[PDB]
Amino acid sequence: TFLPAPLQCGRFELTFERPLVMGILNARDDALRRAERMIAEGADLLDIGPPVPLDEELARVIPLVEALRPLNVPLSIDTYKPAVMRAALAAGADLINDIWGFRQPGAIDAVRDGNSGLCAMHMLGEPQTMQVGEPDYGDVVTDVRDFLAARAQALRDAGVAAERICVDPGFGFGKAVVDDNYALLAALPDTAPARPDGRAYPILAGMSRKSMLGAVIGGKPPLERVAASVAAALCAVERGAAIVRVHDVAATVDALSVWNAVRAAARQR
């Protein structure tokens, strides 16, 4: 029992007495009721996710935000495009999830206003071309914390209050598949830099169905990684995570219901 710092996130003041589950959502009706299921399954947030023409990315994301606004659960956007961020916030999205660390030109300007939650992810890459890079680290843990601290500073320098910001070590983006990813999972609480109050920024962790998983289970396909994905989530929560982003929602909630019983009893002594 440690408590991750709260996250102001749009409509919702989110507090982490228990860690929360982000269901990954990504036909428009197909996905309307796919989200009613996720909520019923125990999802506490919904992650609305070549690449795509702005014309298109907008057609497929903006209706979904308005379609699901009234369900009243935190709605999160997986985008690095400022135009996408600008639009989605206006349509009432609660949290922006950006692989690029709010580095694309304009990104910080598009989100410095309002109450939305912001999660800055670590990734090794050249923002200009959007080419993901090859690993290169001193201590990968020091390096990821260092990077994310610079990004929390950048956001705060443009008016963003410390408490709207959570961070993400970016399993799978520029990391040696096992050596770097598991180093970060093993050291998870040490990957978040300090808020001005001294508390660490809450951490979001997304490992679901990822390569780091398939590499330790003799190479199973992305859809054959459920129990592996659950396991990574528990390890992450056992080590500090505030939120875990997953495709397999009910399994993850079941697991975390066991973990919370355990912690509830370690506290009763």
Numbering used by the authors: 3 to 28, 42 to 64, 73 to 292
What does the original paper state about this entry?
Dihydropteroate synthase (DHPS, EC: 2.5.1.15) catalyses the reaction of 6-hydroxymethyl-7,8-dihydropterin-pyrophosphate with p-aminobenzoic acid (p-ABA) to yield 7,8-dihydropteroate and pyrophosphate. BcDHPS displays a triosephosphate isomerase (TIM)-barrel fold, consisting of eight parallel β-strands surrounded by eight α-helices. The DHPS active site is formed entirely within a single subunit.
The purified protein was used in co-crystallization screens with the inhibitor sulphadoxine or the enzyme product 7,8-dihydropteroate. However, analysis of the crystals grown in the presence of sulphadoxine revealed only water molecules in the active site and this therefore represents the apo-BcDHPS structure determined to 2.35 Å resolution. The apo-enzyme crystallized in space group C2221 with one molecule in the asymmetric unit. A number of residues could not be modeled in the electron density maps and so were omitted hence the model for this structure consists of 268 residues. Nearly 40 amino acids from each subunit participate in around 20 direct hydrogen bonds and salt bridge interactions, plus numerous water mediated contacts between the subunits and The same dimer is formed in the apo-structure by the symmetry operation -x, y, -z + ½. Modeling of loop 2, linking β2 to α2 was possible only in the case of the product complex. The crystallographic analysis of the apo-enzyme clearly showed the normal side chains not interacting with each other.
